[PDB]
């Protein structure tokens, strides 16, 4: 989740509360700060909500200090949210981190045998307890710290702190990141870039294993075994435009309509003649790549309906047999390799529990080798890979993916054009490849100019609580996409059914009010879905159909017809996508949701 | 779907009108018979609903003939359902077919040139005019359709009468079964050896292609060119207790209480020592079998969701890639195919549209070979399959399949432990699956005796209209199949989510009122599971939750445990079926709905 960090001369609360809110998104169940003043006060605050929650719990109450760390949360597995809420004052010790402590019962168990006493539940209160239990045995923090991590178990991001000592802050990155921001005098700690963008914009960022000392005016670097060590130190990119949301009222729609230059970012240095070009991913490629038999994809939510819509293009365009499974129960399940088998994460944090335990996994089961495309840079996807391939998409707030998800089309796209020719193919697949990747931009501009349009039709959501979604083909999933989409933000009960697997049951659903979406292009497969469209039809489902300017569908009370630009159709699947993601948008606003941060939820999942 | 004929010499009506009732499962929106008496005279008959609806139009107007022939019906694309209900009377051609005709255009348009004059939308009064242009050109009847039929394109199965001369009843089978019931001095025709089940028991089952020609003291049957054929003649079997649902309200209940003496049934000659038996290949399965690396399956509705719980087992068991799709995307999508891959389709009626040209593909697309899991012998996939299994499942009648998953399972099951010893594997790994077969019957014995239990359970949903279903491994299928279960029989949107998903999403629609039925056995996978149960709890979500008795989890006003008896594991997926197809079924009493022929649907889908 998110994870700040100060440690200067001025007071750190206004920017560990900045800080917070520059990560509600990767959390936002619980949160709160710590700081102390120069005498030694502590001043730990928590507070169930969003991170202004605290905010007020501030005003109310300023806090001053020159040494804090503050914090959000996810609030999983629930629990008494206030209690279980960070920074937790193990004495003098305070602590927060991110991530999962496995061990965290090995230890809580014998320490406590030590007279310990933690008072709430949580993995945290054991870094602290831990930490401290290792000031008694002798050193210095930036030596008890050094001999404590090495006892945990997981992958965490903490930043400890001593309250009678604030001289000091100790950070340690054992999975999740944990980058430091560098300021005049003062120091930074945060999870991520994004936190310190105010204050800071040059930034060490901490390698994996790395106990870096912080104190006002140093910020030693120590290797895993204890060594010292000259980290670098860069400017920051990551702020293109920051966290700013500019004109749009809520990220997702920003990031929904940065689709248009989002993809031109990615099809940037890599359409490199009439044929896309991926050499990015230097002469070695062609030589695992080509051994290539069979493709096993492993993704959560749309990141995983993306990988979907490209089995559909591996197989038809590629040739190449291709399987893309859910990172959930792949997994945890013995299974049978393919021979020759590229394993491909689509990720876009780069950083979740589930696509990266797979990856993992697939290391030991043989395959072929690796394949990434996180949107993140240095993800813990993209570094234990083999080959990689990045969205440049920009940061994305949204709770919701969407951009990413475009962007991870384009992509895989590129690679089937690659693997095409790469197979001596015919030279025609990858120019239609091309044609498309090499004109989605401005087609999804045009798509977005029918907001208003598609900001009409959600009105008729308001009273709705269901939606169904229906494609066939390589749009089955884009269905799925945009019922994921809906479902989330605004709360409907949206679902994604395969056209033709109606009647074998679902259609019972169907009724006088049940809308159901469905996108359908001059595709081949157009008259078999005119059809299920009529079979719904029939049986009373209104109807709300994206279909091509020229599909022949006919205005309805009952139908209702939405014009779609022609499209191409090797891009097809990526263009209707967006104008699903309009709908789901517009619908929240008419649902009246959190449009960018949906209830139990938040952007990527890192935890497991 | 259902077509019925008589041609004795008593009056037919009360027979057809009961054939009919004997197959408005096949089929239950429109229906209607056609007898003429004596003398000539016509009498067409035609109602929407269920069959009774016609009935009723019966007694008020009693239909007298010894020639008649009736009709149910899937009014699908919907269309004016009484104008374009079967029999269609083409002046004094009447007909009712099963099927699809395909250039029903290039007939349609030719044909109407000849001043010709469609009242009627619809592929079977193209039949008639047909057949009639057909008389005006000289010959017989039997004549007129040897000669027609071969200009017909499609699958049917049509059975043509000439209200001049009621003597003669023609039947032709072009894909569509059609069975000729032998009387006394009378004869019949039907879809299904059941609707004349309480008239004759003596059938003649037609081949593919027969023209038979039937009058009351003749059955004279032609092959496809116009020779004279001698097709034998049996005695039903499919009688056991026909369409008699017995002490039970429904057929499903009953279908479902099947389930222990149905598994019996297909155990039944292949557990021949200790290991899994299925010589029934004959060897030259062995040879084939052998070869196989991969596994591509094809199916719909709940005869995909086995299809599912199998790819676990063949992978985590036997060690073999494989996949295992809906039809109705495979048919029509360009695809890769794995070397040595064993097609199988796993239908339970055999006749289903897309899982059969799935099929029918997979022969062009070089696989080594088709399997077939039928329920239903002599049924297009079983014939036109390579090797075939049957599930000695019993003719099940519901509307919503419930012993054909069952059955489907311990099949699929059974070739596991075939091919995992076929293949040097752990002779122990056949010993265990076997163990768990021969050990289902009286297992899932011991589960119904549950009923009352879940039925308690049912009783909460009377007021709910959503419903998640979560499951994980070789159970998130399970977890799929009694969604589509209670989706179906009982209207409410119930939706199946792998467990481990939905953080990344769905996990939005959780709140106060939305239930949660959760299967969970002591898996390995208890823990991640036990998990997100207690994530969706902590959200609100009123959790329904099927676990083994030994599980830990504990009862609670938001958290419904029902215990599970103790079950082994590699029949876990079939058991934890039954109680979740229990809550279907009485949720839909509850509920008050047709928990035999839901709305919109209809028993096997065989149209395309
Ligand atoms: O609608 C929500 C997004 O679809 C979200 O589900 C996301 O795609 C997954 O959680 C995947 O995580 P990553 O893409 O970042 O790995
Ligand atoms: O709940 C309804 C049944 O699940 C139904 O969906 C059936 O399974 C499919 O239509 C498959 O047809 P076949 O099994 O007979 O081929």
Redo the contacts with the bound molecule.
Sequence with gaps: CGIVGAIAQRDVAEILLEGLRRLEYRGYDSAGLAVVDAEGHMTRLRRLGKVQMLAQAAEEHPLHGGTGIAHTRWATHGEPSEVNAHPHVSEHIVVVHNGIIENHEPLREELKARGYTFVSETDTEVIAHLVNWELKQGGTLREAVLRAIPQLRGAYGTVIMDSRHPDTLLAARSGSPLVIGLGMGENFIASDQLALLPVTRRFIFLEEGDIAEITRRSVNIFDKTGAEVKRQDIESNLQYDAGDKGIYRHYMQKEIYEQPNAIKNTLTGRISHGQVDLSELGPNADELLSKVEHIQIL?????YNSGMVSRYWFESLAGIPCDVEIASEFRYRKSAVRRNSLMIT?????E?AD?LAGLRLSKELGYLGSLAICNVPGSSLVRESDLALMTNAGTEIG???TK??TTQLTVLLMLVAKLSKLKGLDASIEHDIVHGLQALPSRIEQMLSQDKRIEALAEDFSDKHHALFLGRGDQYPIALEGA??LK?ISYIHAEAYAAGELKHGPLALIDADMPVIVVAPNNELLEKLKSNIEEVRARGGQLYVFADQDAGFVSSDNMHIIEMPHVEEVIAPIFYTVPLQLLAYHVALIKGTDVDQPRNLAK??TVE
Tied chains: 1, 2.
């Design positions: 993704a959560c939510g749309t990141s689509l990720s876009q944090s780069g979740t696509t709770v919701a993916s990413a998800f994921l989409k989330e990527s999942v």
